[PDB]
Amino acid sequence: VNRCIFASIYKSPCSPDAYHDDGWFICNNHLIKRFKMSKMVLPIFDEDDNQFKMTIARHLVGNKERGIKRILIPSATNYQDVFNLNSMMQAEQLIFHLIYNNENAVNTICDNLKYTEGFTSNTQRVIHSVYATTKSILDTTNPNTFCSRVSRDELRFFDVTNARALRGGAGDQLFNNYSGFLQNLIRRAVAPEYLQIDTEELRFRNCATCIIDETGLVASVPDGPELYNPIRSSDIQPNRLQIRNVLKFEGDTRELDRTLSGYEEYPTYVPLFLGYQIINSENNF
Amino acid sequence: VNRCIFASIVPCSPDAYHDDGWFICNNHLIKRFKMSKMVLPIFDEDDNQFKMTIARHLVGNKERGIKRILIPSATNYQDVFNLNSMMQAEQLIFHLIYNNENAVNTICDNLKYTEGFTSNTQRVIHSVYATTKSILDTTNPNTFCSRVSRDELRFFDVTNARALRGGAGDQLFNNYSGFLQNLIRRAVAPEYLQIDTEELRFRNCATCIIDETGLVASVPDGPELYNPIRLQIRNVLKFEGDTRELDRTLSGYEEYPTYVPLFLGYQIINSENNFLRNDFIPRAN
Amino acid sequence: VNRCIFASIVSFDACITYKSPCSPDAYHDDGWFICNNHLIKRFKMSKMVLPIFDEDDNQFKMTIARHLVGNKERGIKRILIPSATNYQDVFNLNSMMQAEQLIFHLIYNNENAVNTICDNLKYTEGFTSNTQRVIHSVYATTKSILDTTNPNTFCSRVSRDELRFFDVTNARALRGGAGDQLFNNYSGFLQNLIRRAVAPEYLQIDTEELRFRNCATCIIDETGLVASVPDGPELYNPIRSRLQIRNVLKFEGDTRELDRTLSGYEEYPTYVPLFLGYQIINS
Amino acid sequence: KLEDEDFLKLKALEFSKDIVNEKLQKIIVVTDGMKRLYEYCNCKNSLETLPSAANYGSLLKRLNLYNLDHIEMNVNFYELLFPLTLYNDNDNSDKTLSHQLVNYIFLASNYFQNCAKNFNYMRETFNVFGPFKQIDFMVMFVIKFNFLCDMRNFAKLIDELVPNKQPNMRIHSVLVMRDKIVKLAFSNLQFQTFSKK
Amino acid sequence: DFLKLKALEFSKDIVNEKLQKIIVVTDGMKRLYEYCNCKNSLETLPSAANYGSLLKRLNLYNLDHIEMNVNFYELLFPLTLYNDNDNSDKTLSHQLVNYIFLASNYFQNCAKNFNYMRETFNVFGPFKQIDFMVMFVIKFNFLCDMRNFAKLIDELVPNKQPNMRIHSVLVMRDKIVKLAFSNLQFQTFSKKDKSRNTKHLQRLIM
Ligand SMILES: [Zn+2]
Ligand SMILES: [Zn+2]
Ligand SMILES: [Zn+2]
């Protein structure tokens, strides 16, 4: 029932909603595991017919983190060690090699398994049935294939009008070269900053949330210091000492919240937007 | 004891019975400035809880010109407060608030000219007057034994804050009426905070501007974001496809509302973190 | 007894059986040989009757139809009927079942392709089966309709006395032009059905010329029939029995119970009638 | 660097001349009074409103000589740029320029939006720059001028490419859906009770 | 010569134009301007028979110079802003608005049915630029008819104050006019490299 790649595979506390028809193909549990993002919803409407309960996602990167830590989603470039798959189970390594089209590693794996008794006797069924199942996701994505059943009446853009950026534009090449299911996930996560409509156009946020670079997706504002964001810290080693500094302000008199709590509050979290989307006024045909 | 500035009127929402430096019922804040009294959760979840006053921006998107003004200046006050549409008491109140002594005395003489005044309703009316006056009396920071803010400062620009620079909004506020100044300070969450320890940036874009005419709902750049609010046209726009049913997973996902916050100006805290005194103070720089 | 052509059509195989067949109207004798169901399903029209006065309540009546095309569609969509020029592409026959395509090519006299398919089928088991007989029975029906009359007696009299000018009502509508001249070209079955489908705007008799509309509802077409106005924006066609914008900037309209007040008053219909040129009659 | 810009314009001219094969000349250009065309530096062209454009306030002289005053001038971005879409496919297997063109079009659109929003007061600032109320009209020309220089710059960037027979319909669709609202924007330009002007 | 003497005399007499001038009503231009002599009709699409000699002249001239858009608001709006006082002002306003509606519908139909028009014209005019020729000739026919209408309706008409009703109707019509333009497929297909290709933006300055 689950579509989660991890659920395709010890225990996974897979999100129950991964059993419930939304083709993220991954639980938020594992979006945390490897990427520290949360899937989310944005209902929108004129008259609360609410046709447009669009999916979105937010990161949980720490505001003081720099370098690789800001990369939300690496490109194939250095992905091997951005993920450190070498630390990971062979199943995980195989999955990520499939995603990143590392068929050379796939071959190497199959060769190494070849003479192992654990491959000959058993588990070959497991490996290849799981592989087929996973590939079914590719076969349900990638608009170039899958009955061209990805089309879905609307067309998306990302690298659009990067404020004061110089005349140019790039990285959609790499976007397309990434597995199409990844691109669908990106569409699910990042709503466009603008939408074209048959009649008109609409705007959702004033200023840019994120950037895509050749290295991968990177959380940055266009300019200045990164907007302050404490981690929620609600969720996740002892074999060695682990340490962190943190700056805390240790307030008091907070029971004034007896008064304050009576009034409504506003979110403080991290929606991500990039680029346009377009509903065609007329079919090209 | 209720202390809505319109509880003097001779109805206010129940929240007005509590003490708050809004000095208004949410009813009247709606009916005149179209905004909801709210706060914000400055709650770093690691036992570091705080909140700040806000009123979410809600004036419509399609507004033009003077409509854009959320609150007019004395220079333009009546152009919005078209007093002919407004009751004498309300007019007098606004006159006082704008220090319109001339209009004050004019209404005072209108009392006599309203020959019906012979019933001595003037006595009650003037009582109500003094009741309202109490609020300005209390809030006047200039009173010799008012308590100026320790540790605290606010400015209407990042640079004007950091370098004490003069600027439009700052000087306008300085010249601006004391009570309404206080109400601005109550409503307008900053774009920034300077603690000596650290500077916190809360957005890279800062809602809508203030000008000599008043608070203007104009974003600095681009089109306005959407605002999901007898011989007239309902003009309804509606859309198709209803919603495909994922509602279980949708309700499992995080819900952002479409609310428009305020993010304007720059705060400074210096020499000690000691804000959490909860007595009323005029809190001038 | 049943005479709708679609009722005459039968499936080559048990699957794709002709369920949703012709309605009872197939049995009826309008002489159109088409159920209104199939008229809808293939041409976006519904037949109607015009009552007429014999200068009197004494019965006179004539068949008519409404088109069903929406106001907003253009080109191919508006095309109601093709020419032999373009029927192939309009129908996308390969989408249609082989028997359907067969019949269409018979209608257009594409005998080359028709008999090519027949020659391929000859030794197929499904065509050593009586499908051939079916087709030749439809051929006999065609003979009984056309060779009896349609290009014969009917063509003769239409070219002898009581022609209708299927022609521009006013010559400034040059977009219409002498396309009536093209009426000569079509197969007599089609010409007959067109005449039966479309009313004139006028009739002359020794009793007067009668004007049945001010201004023509249609236009003549470059290949086959196309729903379009002679002039201006297309008049609104309503329609009766998906991630789309459906804004309707309606008046607020708080005057409830409108129909509960008004329902006695005449509920004027809206569906588009069909008018073209002049008929002529002697007694 | 003026000489360099001239040189590169000559190089674009060479490209044009080589791509074009036929003059088809002597068809009379009855329409055009192409008197004394002149150009100014394209620097600062990424933005607008600067008094650097006002610096040649001497333009009143040429206006009085040969006005060419056009009230309420409007723009058909489609009609302008449409020929240039037929280039990305001369080379293959990249959005070698279209990846840039798309956002450049969107940026031009937003430029039109913003200048439309802003001009309504910038009138007064341009009067400050020069008190001639006639400026109020003459301002508008600069609005186009700026993007004219933008296109003149862009022409240097991509002149290796020659019309493809058949464009990506996506480009056309974008052009239509943007330009419709663009041209609609002019609608709001209006006049208010000037009496017997 | 009466076509001048009726109204060009007032046009020259006035020395008072402050916002917008009557740039041309009987003014300027050269041998191209003179072909218009028949009583053109706005009621219907142009009669192709009448313009063949104009086509043969146009063969010598390049037509890409002129932008598609009519400037239906731009050029016309100013040419209406003046009046007498209330006497017969009803006649003025109403006949104006009716002429407006006529022009509107004209352009509309033109747009809708251009295919038939250009095709039929090219039948006898097999000229390489026939599309541009018919394009412009629509414009010019309209302009000539309108010019004659101006000469006819020209009057003392000294009073001047905007009628918001008129301007509302104006905007309402013109917006849809421009929308019709936009709906035009604007030579989207057949490569249209047959065009001058915008003269490659001749010499980067043209
Ligand atoms: Zn899972
Ligand atoms: Zn109140
Ligand atoms: Zn049937």
UniProtKB/Swiss-Prot annotation, chain A:
Keywords from the UniProt entry: Capsid protein, Late protein, Virion
Signal peptide: none
Pfam family membership, one: Baculo_VP39
Nucleotide-binding as UniProt keyword: no
Compartment list: Virion
Top-level taxon: Viruses
GO cellular component terms given for this protein: host cell nuclear matrix; viral capsid; virion component
Single GO molecular function: structural molecule activity
Note: Expressed late in infection.
Family as reported in the entry's similarity comment: Belongs to the baculoviridae major capsid protein family.
Role: Most abundant structural protein of the nucleocapsid produced during the infection cycle. The monomers are arranged in stacked rings around the nucleoprotein core.
Protein name: Major capsid protein
UniProtKB/Swiss-Prot annotation, chain D:
Superkingdom per UniProt: Viruses
Name of the protein: Capsid-associated protein VP80
Quaternary structure note: Homodimer. Interacts with host nuclear F-actin.
Role according to the record: Structural protein that plays a role in the packaging of nucleocapsids and in their egress from the nucleus toward the cell periphery.
Subcellular location(s) per record: Host nucleus; Virion
Source species of the chain: Autographa californica nuclear polyhedrosis virus (AcMNPV)
